[PDB]
């Protein structure tokens, strides 16, 4: 989430061990570090262009993606820098030889290299435990607005 | 802490307890081959019953199926070996048929008498 203010915290936010020498005058004023997550996921430009900090970011941060890669549709963006997704699926009951609708909600971190709104399908991938609940990180967006600009005014 | 010693029971018992026809049919078989038990008939019917089951299931499979050919021939060759199954009908549509006496006829009880040596099933 973020939304500016950058240095807004009590502690000074910085990327660890990335050092910008004040004696040497540079043009970007801050040396920025980033990596490529792997599994062919594009590291979004906003991560490289961005000023944000987020030590929990898969592109700019200290975590790493390994294990399960899952998708789900976004059912809540309320908590700052983290979302909740619903993953539907059909569960097979053999005796009746049919299925039933089931779902799980999976809490997952979202870097502010992404702008997410409710309804977007999103791809996530597994994490070291980030928080009490969140075990996953948002690694790509498969939707955009779900046709928001198509809601516009009278012709 | 030892591996369980496995076991199985060798007989089955008829549901209808009193069936005058089955009873008569049973006694004769005993009175012929010289058996002390209805169980000695019950046992054979159970052995025969599992054989027919195996046979039945094999038949539902497609002809020349790898499992069917392998296991089918084994069943046949086992049955033929002991002398229940005729050499002429080797193809297991007759093992599906068979019947009890074909098994009874092969007991050492009977062979010792059929060959003389006894001149009674009971002396046998």
């Amino acid at each position: 989430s973020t939304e500016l203010t950058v240095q807004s915290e009590r502690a000074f936010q910085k990327q660890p061990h990335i050092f910008n020498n004040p004696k040497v005058k540079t043009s970007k004023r801050t040396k920025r570090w980033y990596k490529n997550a792997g599994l062919g996921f594009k590291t979004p430009k906003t991560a490289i262009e961005g000023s944000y900090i987020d030590k929990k970011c898969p592109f700019t941060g200290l975590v790493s993606i390994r294990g399960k890669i899952l998708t789900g549709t976004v059912v809540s963006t309320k908590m700052h820098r983290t979302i909740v997704i619903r993953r539907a699926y059909l569960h097979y009951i053999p005796k009746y030889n049919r299925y039933e609708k089931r779902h799980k909600n999976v809490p997952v971190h979202v870097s502010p290299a992404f702008r997410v709104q409710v309804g977007d399908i999103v791809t996530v991938g597994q994490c070291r435990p980030i928080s009490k609940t969140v075990r996953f990180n948002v690694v790509k967006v498969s939707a955009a607005a779900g046709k928001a600009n198509k809601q516009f005014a009278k012709f | 802490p030892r591996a369980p010693r496995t076991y199985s029971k060798t007989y089955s018992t008829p549901k209808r307890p009193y069936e005058s026809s089955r009873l008569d049919a049973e006694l004769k078989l005993a009175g012929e081959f010289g058996l002390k038990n209805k169980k000695e008939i019950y046992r054979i019917s159970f052995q025969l019953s599992k054989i027919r089951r195996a046979a039945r299931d094999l038949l539902t499979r497609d002809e020349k199926d790898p499992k069917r050919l392998f296991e089918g021939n084994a069943l046949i060759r086992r049955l033929v070996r002991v002398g229940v199954l005729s050499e002429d009908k080797k193809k297991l549509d007759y093992v599906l048929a068979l019947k009890v006496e074909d098994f009874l006829e092969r007991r050492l009880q009977t062979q010792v008498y059929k060959l003389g040596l006894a001149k009674s099933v009971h002396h046998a």
């Binding site: 915290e9 009590r10 000074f12 910085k14 910008n20 020498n21 004040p22 009490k132 | -």
Partner: protein
Amino acid sequence: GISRDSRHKRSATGAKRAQFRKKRKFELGRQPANTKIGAKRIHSVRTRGGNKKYRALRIETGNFSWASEGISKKTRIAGVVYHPSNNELVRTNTLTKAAIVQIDATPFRQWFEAHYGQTLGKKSKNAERKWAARAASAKIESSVESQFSAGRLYACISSRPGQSGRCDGYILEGEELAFYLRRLTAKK
């Protein structure tokens, strides 16, 4: 003892969870070093599988490195002026990581005026060459240089004293120094 398990602590649904098993030695926590300043006192602690940890209480000196200057010195730790986690750490001059301290500057001055032949604030033949080959880049920085007058320098603690028994850090510079300078006066 202190237990680090999640088996207490209601589930994400909010449900209350029954007690399963008992406190295991391996989910154990321990009490804070709450390490303070002066008169070195260190107590080792026996951790999992041999493996000493050094719990500091009362440290008077640490190893502080000037980053842009590519050196490190051992200096007295004067005090704790700022902490982001808790203010009581500052009130009580408690040493933990990320704490903002004030240290010495006399060791850092000595090396500088020896290395650059300059003397912040306000004869040998070989040395003269070195100093002349140097400077032009002796320009230091405003906010960092004006601090030597005080004979005290702002620095951040980068180590974990209740863990390693070391209190170590780096002189504050640039943007980061700016940040804490603002915080200091805008509350003071």
